[PDB]
Ligand binder design. Sequence first.
Ligand SMILES: O=P(O)(O)OC[C@H]1C[NH2+]C[C@@H]1O
Ligand SMILES: O=P(O)(O)OC[C@H]1C[NH2+]C[C@@H]1O
Lengths: 127, 131
Amino acid sequence: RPALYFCGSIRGGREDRTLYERIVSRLRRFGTVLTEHVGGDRLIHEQDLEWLQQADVVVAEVTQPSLGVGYELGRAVAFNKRILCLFRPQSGRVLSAMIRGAADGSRFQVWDYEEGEVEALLDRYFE
Amino acid sequence: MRPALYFCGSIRGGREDRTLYERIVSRLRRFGTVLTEHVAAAEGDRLIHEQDLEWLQQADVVVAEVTQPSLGVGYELGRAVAFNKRILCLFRPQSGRVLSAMIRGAADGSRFQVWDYEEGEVEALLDRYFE
Ligand SMILES: O=P(O)(O)OC[C@H]1C[NH2+]C[C@@H]1O
Ligand SMILES: O=P(O)(O)OC[C@H]1C[NH2+]C[C@@H]1O
């Protein structure tokens, strides 16, 4: 059972907070989830990085633009983590080229999806 | 040999601050070679990622305007930290936003600096850091 780290916008905005709760709930079926979503900012940075380094898979919902989500993904790539990013084209946004373009299709995957189907998608990824 | 400076700022996260980014890039060009995806208005995704990452890896200093939330800007900063780069981040409290804890909290006051500023003062701030 993998250790899972979940990334999603907070100070970038909480528009997708309910969807993040669904994602985290489904991820908890497959492994232990660490996430901020359940001094000062230095402590948050250190704690989030600690949990990210411990994870077997980093899962990020990348629809809402966020510096912190991007930063976590950049650190995760440099740590050579297995990464799953989830993006909703129905938002009308174009996903950052730095995230879409970082994908290699194996270790770093980016999946476009419709909101209602996120649980099934996670089921498929996590077998 | 001119110092190599990489400039980060939101694009697909939103172009609200694009005119300000042109001012920053123009000032940075006084101090060294500027590498950036940003193009002055008067002038696939894997290709963009690889090109921007190569420029970042080749830079001495990474300068980011971090007021507009952006996945790409954050990703570049994360890669830059792991690449052992010197980093300067610029944030405007007049936006009313609370800057991401991952950026504010990554600061160490020397090789990763985060400065709050007012828009009309950005050239003077850059002159201070680079002189
Ligand atoms: O506050 P931000 O939106 O910039 O970043 C939030 C992400 C970074 N750390 C926790 C969460 O995944
Ligand atoms: O499109 P985004 O906002 O996600 O990211 C833009 C930054 C990432 N690469 C160029 C620029 O600095």
